[PDB]
A paper describes a structure:
Ciliary movement is generated by the axoneme, a molecular machine consisting of microtubules, ATP-powered dynein motors and regulatory complexes. The prototypic axoneme of a motile cilium consists of a cylindrical arrangement of doublet microtubules (DMTs) surrounding a central apparatus comprising two singlet microtubules. In total, there are 11 dynein motors in a single 96-nm repeat unit, and they are classified according to their location (inner and outer) and the number of heavy chains (HCs) they have.
To investigate species-specific differences between axonemes, we used our cryo-EM approach to determine a structure and atomic model of the 96-nm modular repeat of human DMT isolated from ciliated 2D organoids resembling the respiratory epithelium. The model clarifies the composition of human RS1 and RS2, revealing simpler spoke heads, necks and bases (in the case of RS1) than in C. reinhardtii. The simpler architectures of RS1 and RS2 may be compensated by a full-length RS3, which we show is built on a base of CFAP61, CFAP91 and CFAP251. Our model demonstrates that human IDAf and the ODA are even more structurally similar than in C. reinhardtii because there are fewer additional subunits, including the α-HC and equivalents of LC5 and FAP120. In humans, IDAb and IDAe are positioned in line with, and closer to, IDAa and IDAc, where they interact directly with the tubulin surface of protofilament A03 through the DNALI1 subunit, rather than with a regulatory complex or docking factor. Our human DMT model contains around 25 proteins linked to PCD and 20 others associated with either PCD-like phenotypes or male infertility.
Author numbering:
A (entry chain k1): 154 to 248
B (entry chain l7): 38 to 142
C (entry chain k3): 91 to 255, 373 to 394, 431 to 627
D (entry chain l4), G (entry chain l3), H (entry chain l6), I (entry chain l5), J (entry chain l1), K (entry chain l2): 1 to 89
E (entry chain k2): 238 to 342
F (entry chain l8): 12 to 113
The structure:
């Protein structure tokens, strides 16, 4: 009979730890309090076109690169369904 | 209220209307992206989101077998302010349109 | 049990904490409730402390033969869960207050200072908003409690927080609560001088020893603490810490349980007065029916007004209240290791005290000096 | 038109079909008074429009721990009636 | 007004194909290209590129519904007035003394 | 909204996250995450009453052209936009930060 | 030991693990009082000894229309608390 | 014509043959109910369309690490069904 | 060592590295819970050990149409998780 | 033992638990003289024995219109004290 | 218009809805001289305005122990008549 061999890690989990996206900081929450009389302020909104502001448009020009003439056929791509099995909890609001 | 799916449908309609036969050209292309950003902004005005500031960003580029990543982390009021995006991609270029609608108090 | 019923109606008749199902329901409601303020955490902390006190009273009053081991470990685990969840909710409320107040990294407020004083928890928060290296003396307003932070901490984006809630704990007792000193991140390394105030309910007959909590070792330790100075007139303890953490003042656990004399005299048939004179104080205690009260304190022949005076309660809560106030005249089983005693036979003591209490309604009894010179099997006392 | 405001508590959804879930629950509350028929109306309409293997929980006092596929979870209140709509399968 | 940092919002992800000849992966690229060309050329052993079926076995989901038992809901009103108390007591004592007299005969 | 301050924050975040690293698409996603997370954290540490929208474009230097245009709509006296382009021998990084007053 | 009688209402199950659901509900009502925590305990326990996703609905007033795998539907009352437990995934 | 909205998550094609992947999947979802036959229809059609070295997976809960040809990768959702289409060789 | 039974469904190699695929899939199921990671681990190690030209896909609900090499095709179950692994380069 | 005869006026109840209400009222009047503590003692014993959703009104002059669960309404006389004990919740 | 003052002894409600309890009680005292009809008027007005399962206790001697929902409790005097109004269900 084939004995269940002890699993031997083979280095391909290291690239998974490289590829996994981890959030460095916790989600930051800010509360700002304003009086209700200042809500519904009169609106002074204006268009800012990309042609009107120099910083609104940034262009990287194209050039013929002779280094990138090696046409591989071989990109390794990983994908998944949107993560977490989502064992989520809902409760009715108890008075 | 800002509706991301309806905004995405309108953005997709404009992207399919304009970029269906559009190939890569660096001469006409900055004017094209400025026009696309202004036009998407103006059609989100014509949808009529009251008390909503509008942020529209368009990133288009050449297709040659390249590596591109587009993402955003933002800081808004999650109950009123919301966002959407669309991607067009043809034989010669790739286009990303990101819309962020922020309610004003 | 009936008194539990009565004061349960009087204080928390609406929430119903007495049943274990509703206690777990309380754990449940605190998990459901979010963004709890410090006042809400305090208002429910009264219920938490009532539940812990009731469980402790059950464990101390129900005999061990009637107490199942499952019941004992369940009540102890409930007490520990209540304490840990309560401290977690204080931490959550403190984080809510910090993110309410601090907001910006600099806040344009110079140096945020907040002092919150309660019966059980006293909080001091200071934020380094200016990041001024020349400002190293952090002194809270209206108090002498403060710190002397280094220049790196005076330039860093920190807040210094005080939360006032290997040491052989059989030899030393912890007094005055726990002062949690922390450096929190604001939303070459010299020791930091910390000046604290001793709790007024604690009488230190000697200089208190400053000890810090080794959390990895899970015990109190005397290392890492220097520049220890005590001002008894101002009740101020100044000491230098290498690393911040939980810090408490300790004294030797067995210092005032030894005493000189005693006298149990009847006031009525159903009432007696026990006067116990120690080296430091004369404690008069009145016993009537199932209640005992602290009649009087003579601190070195000076009358001392105590909060416990005038309040009748059952004997084991009376012992607990006197021990918490520092008037510990009730020895433990290990008290003979550190107290010079005239150890008698326990059976002789039990029979003698039973007949003592039987005759206490009409006979006054007094301490005999020949008790010390009679042997262990015999007891000598004065009667009238 | 019953004036029952949709109070969205938790919604791993997209916003158009958040409105569709609100509209279908509004039609289900108006047409049916038993919560099993309200859950029948919301789930079946989400079976035809957004593929089978949905699940709907309708009631005023229920606590759930449910596994849902992603972008297919909403739990909201229509008046005092709580509607839990998640998809698994 | 509560402002909260949002999550990862990826709008576009184009993996590269163009790897430089000066890059460290270029020789692995060239060997992979040669191996893929060799595979596309050779079909020697039996059906080398035989297309095969596979399917996960899961599901078979059927329908049964649940409705909770409805607690029947009833209004009720009472009369606690002392005059009604004494009149009721007089009524029951009167009927008790009325029924107690019929057993002697 | 100070455009120079926002540009300095964006440049610091880009240099802290990407650095002098070459192009690796397995790490492009993590670099994209870290740039905008650091930018958003520093903008909230500035703490001015602005909702912040920070977007990142990361582009392999293979000779293919890229650009970024933003046509937006606000109260132009108070709110602002700042787009910063950074590059190394192998990378392009275009980060746009929009602050919108409350 | 809370004397709450298990009243099986609808169950396409096998009889051995109907006792497992009753015992798991009896344990969950004893330790927990939130119905989603009871739904958390019953589903997670059923997740470790059967494997697929599972879904637990606990409450006193809810109506459901759910799609379950074969031999994987049970609904019962533990006293006045109704526990719905179906497997789908 | 089932109203399953084509949501493209990751694409490396042209619009001529992103749309071809959308319509062939829509034909394959309508014609076949088993995911292996849906993948059979998609790859067979694209083997005769863009050379016979494609690969297709049809399903709802899966993840892959695949190697793809230049301008020959796409991963999209046709409603709730996740479909990968990559050409290798 | 998670005792997940290896039920080999379609074996088309030698027995030695059928065992390696079972052993490799055991490694990824123990340190990871995401099927993309489980697909990434088996693919690249098989890239590292049996030429850099493999393909792996892992999930619970997925049915494919794939092209492989003779003596380079497996599809097996490690517990409930279905793992398909094939070389097409 | 006080010979307070129980007069039942309106009891939507069972017979065994009408007696439980009478006996619990008998110990409540004996232990407590204030009607708010009599209502406290009757309610909790009914809260503990059956369900923690009872309500008790004790007095000599009060007119109420309360909404009760069926088989959970009693209004009886114990001497000159009127006790309304109904369950709602 | 009788000048019957409203002193609020206990109130777990909001101010606009405590006032509605006072105004409805003033109307109920005016039309009805009988406390149950006063209690029937206040409760049924509160049933249609702030959902069902309200309870009204009106009288001149009553000691109560009742369970109420949060922000749904009042105990007040209108002249010499104490009126207790709480919601439960």
């Amino acid at each position: 009979p084939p004995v269940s061999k002890p699993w031997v890690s083979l280095g391909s989990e290291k690239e998974i730890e490289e590829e996994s996206v981890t959030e460095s900081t916790k989600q930051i929450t800010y509360m700002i309090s304003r009086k209700r009389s200042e809500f519904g302020a009169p609106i002074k909104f204006s268009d800012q076109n990309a042609s009107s502001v120099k910083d609104a448009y940034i262009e990287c020009t194209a050039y013929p690169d002779k280094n990138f003439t090696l046409k591989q056929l071989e990109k390794d791509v990983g994908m998944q369904v949107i993560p977490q099995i989502k064992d989520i909890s809902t409760q009715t609001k108890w008075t | 209220r800002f509706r991301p799916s309806v905004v995405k449908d309108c953005i997709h309609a404009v992207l399919k209307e304009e970029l269906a036969n559009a190939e890569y050209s660096p001469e006409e292309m900055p004017q094209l992206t400025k026009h696309l950003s202004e036009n998407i902004k103006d059609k989100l005005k014509e949808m009529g989101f009251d008390r909503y500031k509008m942020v529209v960003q368009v990133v288009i580029g050449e297709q040659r077998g390249e590596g591109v990543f587009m993402a955003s982390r933002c800081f808004w009021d999650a109950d009123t302010d919301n966002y959407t995006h669309d991607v067009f991609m043809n034989d010669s270029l790739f286009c990303v349109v990101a819309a962020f609608g922020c309610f004003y108090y | 049990l009936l008194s539990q019923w009565k004061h349960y109606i009087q204080c928390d008749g609406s929430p119903d904490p007495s049943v274990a199902q509703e206690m777990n329901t309380f754990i449940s409601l605190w998990k459901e409730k979010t963004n709890e303020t410090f006042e809400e955490v305090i208002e429910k902390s009264k219920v938490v402390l009532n539940l812990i006190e009731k469980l402790k009273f059950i464990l101390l009053e129900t005999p061990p033969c009637d107490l199942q081991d499952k019941n004992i470990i369940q009540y102890q685990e409930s007490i520990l869960q209540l304490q840990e969840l309560l401290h977690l909710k204080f931490g959550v409320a403190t984080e809510i207050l910090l993110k309410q107040a601090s907001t910006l990294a600099d806040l344009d407020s110079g140096n945020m200072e907040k002092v919150i004083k309660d019966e059980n928890v006293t909080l001091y928060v200071w934020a380094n908003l200016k990041k001024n290296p020349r400002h190293r003396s952090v002194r809270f307003s209206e108090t002498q409690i403060g710190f002397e932070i280094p220049r790196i901490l005076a330039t860093s984006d920190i807040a210094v927080r005080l939360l006032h809630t290997v040491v052989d704990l059989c030899q030393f007792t912890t007094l005055g609560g726990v002062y949690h000193l922390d450096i929190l991140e604001l939303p070459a390394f010299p020791p930091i001088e910390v000046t604290l105030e001793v709790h007024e309910n604690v009488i230190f007959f000697e200089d208190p020893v400053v000890v810090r909590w080794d959390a990895e070792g899970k015990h109190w330790r005397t290392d890492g603490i220097s520049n220890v100075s005590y001002k008894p007139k101002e009740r101020l303890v100044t000491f230098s810490l290498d690393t911040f953490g939980p810090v408490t003042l300790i004294q030797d656990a067995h210092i005032n349980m030894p005493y000189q004399s005693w006298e149990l005299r009847p006031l009525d048939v159903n009432k007696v007065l026990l006067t116990v004179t120690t080296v430091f104080t004369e404690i008069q205690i009145q016993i009537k029916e199932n209640l005992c009260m602290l009649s009087s304190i003579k601190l070195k022949d000076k009358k001392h007004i105590s909060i416990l005076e005038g309040t009748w309660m059952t004997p084991i809560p009376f012992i607990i209240a006197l021990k918490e106030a520092g008037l510990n005249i009730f020895p433990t089983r290990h008290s003979h290791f550190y107290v010079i005693i005239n150890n008698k036979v326990p059976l002789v003591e039990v029979k003698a005290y039973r007949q003592m209490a039987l005759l206490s309604s009409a006979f006054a009894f007094g301490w005999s000096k020949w008790n010390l010179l009679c042997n262990s099997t015999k007891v000598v006392f004065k009667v009238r | 038109m019953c004036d029952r405001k949709a109070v969205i508590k938790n919604a791993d959804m997209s916003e158009e079909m958040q409105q569709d879930s609100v509209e279908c629950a509004t039609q289900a509350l108006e047409k049916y008074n038993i919560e099993k028929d309200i859950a029948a109306h919301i789930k079946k309409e989400f079976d035809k429009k957004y593929n089978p293997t949905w699940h709907c929980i309708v009631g005023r006092n229920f606590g759930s721990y449910v596994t849902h596929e992603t972008k297919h979870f909403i739990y909201f209140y229509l008046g005092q009636v709580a509607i839990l709509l998640f998809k698994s399968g | 007004i509560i402002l909260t940092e949002t999550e990862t919002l990826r709008f576009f992800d184009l993996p590269t194909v163009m790897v430089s000849v000066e890059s460290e992966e270029a020789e692995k690229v060239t060997q992979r290209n040669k191996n893929y060309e060799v595979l596309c050329r050779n079909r020697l052993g039996n059906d080398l590129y035989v297309e095969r079926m596979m399917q996960t076995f899961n599901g078979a989901p059927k329908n049964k519904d649940v409705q909770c038992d409805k607690i029947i809901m009833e209004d009720k009103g009472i009369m606690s007035t002392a005059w009604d108390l004494y009149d009721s007591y007089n009524a029951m004592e009167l009927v008790s003394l009325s029924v107690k007299q019929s057993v002697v005969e | 909204f100070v455009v120079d301050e926002v540009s300095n924050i964006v440049k610091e975040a880009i240099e802290s996250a990407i650095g002098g690293n070459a192009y690796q698409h397995s790490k492009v996603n993590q670099w994209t995450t870290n740039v905008v997370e650091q930018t958003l954290s520093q903008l909230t540490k500035l703490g001015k009453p602005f909702k912040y929208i920070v977007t990142c474009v990361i582009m392999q230097k293979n000779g293919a052209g890229l650009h970024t245009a933003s046509s937006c709509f606000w109260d132009s006296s108070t709110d602002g936009s700042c787009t910063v382009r950074w590059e190394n021998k192998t990378m392009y990084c275009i980060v746009s930060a929009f602050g919108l007053s409350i």
